[PDB]
């Protein structure tokens, strides 16, 4: 980076992948964003206006303001001794709802559905056990490890 411009470092970060070129698909226009929701900021390059800065590409935060064509996101940018909490304004083409929170909110459902399942039983599925615990092994086939005379002429090709 010689010139320290606005979008000074990027012929790759902002390039579209090979044979993925195109303008943004419908499915990302028909997503809707509620305030408080987590989001990935990934800048699409086929929409000029509204891009996030080079730093924010690839981060996640909590949407806060929602405007007709815009959004806004709260992202943690570490600075000298501290993390400022930055508010950026993006055109939502660059925004995708994050799956980050997901496996947790699925752990919470599979607890409650578990709990209402014990309430009056029906019992419950069995608890899987460790693979690291003991056992006798009954080998179906057994072979020998050795270094072969032939193994060396394979490592000098040609």
């Amino acid at each position: 980076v010689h010139s320290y411009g606005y979008k000074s470092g990027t012929r790759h970060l902002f390039a579209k992948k090979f044979r993925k070129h195109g303008a943004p698909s419908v499915s990302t226009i028909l997503t809707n964003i509620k305030v408080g929701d987590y989001v990935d900021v990934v800048a699409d390059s086929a929409v000029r206006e509204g891009m996030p800065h080079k730093y924010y590409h690839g981060r996640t935060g909590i949407v806060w303001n929602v405007t007709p064509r815009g959004v806004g996101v709260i992202i943690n940018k570490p600075v000298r001794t501290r993390t400022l909490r930055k508010r950026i304004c993006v055109r939502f083409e660059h925004v995708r709802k994050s799956r980050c929170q997901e496996a947790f909110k699925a752990k919470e459902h599979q607890f409650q559905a578990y709990l209402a399942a014990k309430k009056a039983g029906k019992a419950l599925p069995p608890l899987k056990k460790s693979s690291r615990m003991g056992g006798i092994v009954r080998p179906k086939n057994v072979e020998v490890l050795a270094r072969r005379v032939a193994d060396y002429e394979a490592m000098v090709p040609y």
Partner: protein
Amino acid sequence: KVVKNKAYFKRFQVKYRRRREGKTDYHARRQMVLQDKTKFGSPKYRLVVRITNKDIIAQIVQAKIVGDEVVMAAYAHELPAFGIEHGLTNYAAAYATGLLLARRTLAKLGIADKFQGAKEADGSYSAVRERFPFKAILDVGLARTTTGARVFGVLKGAVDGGMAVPHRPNRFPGYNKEKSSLDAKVHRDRIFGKHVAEYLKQVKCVQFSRYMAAKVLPESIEGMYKKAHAAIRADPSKSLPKTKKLSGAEKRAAAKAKVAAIRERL
């Protein structure tokens, strides 16, 4: 020379199926489907008018990710139930469709008799909007929107049916454009089919063969549609009564046989 070179297909990117097939204009619906993000999932409909020669289709379509969904759908070919037996693709029928769609959706959504809209179809332009009427966009498709075009006939078929479709009386037939005013007369004549009723009398083997054979008098036409209009409004829901693939072994087996066949001749 050869520009279909092996490396050409290799880096080639394909346009969307509906673009290859030439069916949808993606820079268009992408602008039609979109909505203010502050309106979150708020349902937004659009009425699509697609005229396939020998027929007309007017649908009211909510658009969502898994796919578009259709509230109700009207067709020109359902008009014979209402008394329109000939010229189902003309402007007059294009008006009835969309008067059928508009009245069939307002029964669908339950609005029913609350919104009616002008029954005289002494066609004229009015601004679109104490309750605010049901609102749907017109989706032209790939048609050229030239003034007079039938796609905008369905438009005021719906408007006259109570649906609120934002428009300006710019492309309706009978519009000067030298003066900003629409002439409702020439537009009415086009609605009830006078443009067709005048062009039979001018003919009397191929052109209008079914009109002449089925003995429609050019004078009866402006009354034929008029009865069908008031019939659509009464009963909306009345309509027309009532190689196997080769497997992975077969493709390969047929191939090694085809080679050994010609490998045995030499």
